[PDB]
C-alpha cells in the first residue's frame, strides 16, 4: 500500500487523546487533553465545529451506527451523550468513580460501554441514560472496551494482563484470554467480522487472538509501545493491514497474514496515540500527544 500525507489537522491546544471516523464516512471526530471535542470533514480535513462540555480532558470518543450521536469519555468521571448537528449535550451518564478511559456504541446505538481506572466496565442505556450494568471486571484500569459486529459480545481490557469476553445481556464473562505472560493490556477490539481480536501490549506487540479457540494466532512487532494505551485496527477497505501508532512517532502498518511491515508513514513529532480506519475509502486518520497535537490524514 500507499498512504500519503495529504492533510494535516490543526486546533487542539493539548494532546489529541483518540480520532475515529464517522460510519457514514464523512466525518472525523477528535478528542483532546484541551477538554474539547472537534469534529472534521473527512474528505478534505477541513474544520466544521468544536463540541465541549467536560470539565476535563477527554480521553476518549466513539460515534453512533447512524453518525448522529457522539460519545465522549472524561477524566471528569462522566461520560455525555452528545447530539452532532446541533451540538447539544443530550445526556450525562454518572456512575464511574474515577477517569473514564474508553467507550463505545453498540451496533444497534441503543447501549453504550465505559471502561474506567476504577477497573470497572458499566453498560449504559443510551435513551434514559442511566447504568444497565456494572461488571467486576478487571484489578486494574481498564484501557478499552468493544462491541461485537451484532453486539451480542464486549471484550475489555487491562493493566493488569488480561482480556475477557463479556455477554452483553446477561453481564457474565465468556472467557478470559491469557498467552505465556501477561503484559499489561493496553488496547483490545474486535475484527469486523468478529471472528477475532487484536490485542495490544505494553511490550511492544500487537497480537491476533482468535477468540472461540482462544488461541493466539498472530503476532506483529517491529513498533515501540511501552507506556500508552495505543489505538490500532483493521483495514479492511483495500489490502487486509494491522494499523498501529507507535511511540516511536509513526503509524505502522502490517501485512495482516504475513506479518510484515509493508508501510512506516513518517510525519508526526510525538507518539502516535490514535488511529483510525475509513469506513469506505483507503483512508488513515493519526493524531499525536502534547508536542505534536495535531491529526493527519493518509490516503492510499
Ligand atoms: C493525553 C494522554 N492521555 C492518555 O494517554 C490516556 C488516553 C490515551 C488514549 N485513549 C484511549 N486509549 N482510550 N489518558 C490518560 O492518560 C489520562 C487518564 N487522561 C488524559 O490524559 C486526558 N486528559 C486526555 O486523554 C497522556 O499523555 N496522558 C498522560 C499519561 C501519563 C502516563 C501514561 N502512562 N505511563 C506509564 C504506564 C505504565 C508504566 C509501567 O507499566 C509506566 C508508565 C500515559 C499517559
Not at 456504541?105 to 477497573?119: A, H, K, R, T
Not at 505494553?202 to 472461540?212: A, E, G, P, R
Amino acid at each position: 500500500p500507499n498512504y500519503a500525507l495529504k492533510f494535516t489537522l490543526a486546533g487542539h491546544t493539548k494532546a489529541v487523546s483518540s480520532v475515529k471516523f464517522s460510519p457514514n464516512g464523512e466525518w472525523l471526530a477528535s478528542s483532546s487533553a484541551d477538554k474539547l471535542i472537534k469534529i472534521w470533514g473527512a474528505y478534505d480535513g477541513k474544520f466544521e465545529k468544536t463540541i465541549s462540555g467536560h470539565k476535563l480532558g477527554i480521553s476518549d470518543v466513539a460515534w453512533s451506527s447512524d453518525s448522529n450521536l457522539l460519545v465522549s469519555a472524561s477524566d471528569d468521571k462522566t461520560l455525555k451523550i452528545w447530539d452532532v448537528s446541533s451540538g447539544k449535550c443530550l445526556k450525562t451518564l454518572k456512575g464511574h468513580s474515577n477517569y473514564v478511559f474508553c467507550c463505545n456504541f453498540n451496533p444497534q446505538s441503543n447501549l453504550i460501554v465505559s471502561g474506567s481506572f476504577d477497573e470497572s466496565v458499566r453498560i449504559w442505556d443510551v435513551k434514559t441514560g442511566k447504568c444497565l450494568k456494572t461488571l467486576p471486571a478487571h484489578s486494574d484500569p481498564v484501557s478499552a472496551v468493544h462491541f461485537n459486529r451484532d453486539g451480542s459480545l464486549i471484550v475489555s481490557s487491562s493493566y493488569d494482563g488480561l482480556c475477557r469476553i463479556w455477554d452483553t445481556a446477561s453481564g457474565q464473562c465468556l472467557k478470559t484470554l491469557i498467552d505465556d505472560d501477561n503484559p499489561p493490556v493496553s488496547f483490545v477490539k474486535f475484527s469486523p467480522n468478529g471472528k477475532y481480536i487484536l490485542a495490544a501490549t505494553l511490550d511492544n506487540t500487537l497480537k491476533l487472538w482468535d477468540y472461540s479457540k482462544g488461541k493466539c494466532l498472530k503476532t506483529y512487532t517491529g513498533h515501540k509501545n511501552e507506556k500508552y494505551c495505543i489505538f490500532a485496527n483493521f483495514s479492511v477497505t483495500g489490502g487486509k493491514w494491522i494499523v498501529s501508532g507507535s511511540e516511536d512517532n509513526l503509524v505502522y502498518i502490517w501485512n495482516l497474514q504475513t506479518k510484515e511491515i509493508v508501510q512506516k508513514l513518517q510525519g508526526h513529532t510525538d507518539v502516535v496515540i490514535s488511529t483510525a480506519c475509513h469506513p469506505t475509502e483507503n483512508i488513515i486518520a493519526s493524531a499525536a500527544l502534547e508536542n505534536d497535537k495535531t491529526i493527519k490524514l493518509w490516503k492510499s
